[PDB]
């Protein structure tokens, strides 16, 4: 029933109401001075006046290619451990089995020997990928 319902001991932690008497957290609540912190909060940027570590270091080299053809990869060894028999797979079958998200262009990676007889359809194979998948009997595709 409801008169027999308790959380797990470990959650439902006691809130710390600070300015509640000099026995728990008393007057200053943790900002125990008359400084700046005792009324307000100094940011993470401000460092005293000397140039912060985000102004004296240099902006990271190079640009960001607007047209970065980002793919989604699927593991040839883990495409073995996805399909033990296999024989017929393809990007839709990967997103079906839940190996990579939808709305995707796929590459197939090359960690681990794929020892299943499989043919794979997916754009943009890598070196070891095509090697292993075309040595597992099956081949690569586009």
């Amino acid at each position: 029933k409801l008169h027999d319902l308790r959380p797990a001991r470990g959650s439902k932690i006691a809130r710390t109401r600070v300015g509640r008497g000099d026995g728990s957290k008393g007057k200053t609540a943790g900002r125990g001075t008359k400084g700046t912190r005792a009324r307000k909060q100094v940011p993470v940027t401000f460092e005293g006046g000397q140039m912060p570590i985000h102004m004296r270091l240099p902006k990271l080299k190079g640009f960001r290619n607007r047209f970065r053809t980002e793919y989604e990869i699927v593991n040839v060894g883990d495409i073995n451990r996805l399909f033990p028999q296999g024989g017929a797979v393809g990007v839709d079958d990967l997103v079906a089995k839940g190996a990579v998200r939808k709305n995707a262009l796929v590459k197939v990676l090359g960690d681990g020997k794929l020892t299943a007889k499989v043919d794979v359809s997916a754009h943009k194979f890598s070196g070891s990928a095509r090697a292993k998948i075309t040595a597992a009997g099956g081949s690569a595709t586009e």
Binding site: I53, P58, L60
Partner: peptide, 26 residues
């Protein structure tokens, strides 16, 4: 996100942030 410090810092393949050791410009 603080812009100026995301244009100077880089989270790597794991929990590492890599600054650029570059009093190497002028």
């Amino acid at each position: 996100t603080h812009s100026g410090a995301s244009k100077r810092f880089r989270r790597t393949g794991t929990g590492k942030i890599v600054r650029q050791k570059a009093n190497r410009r002028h």
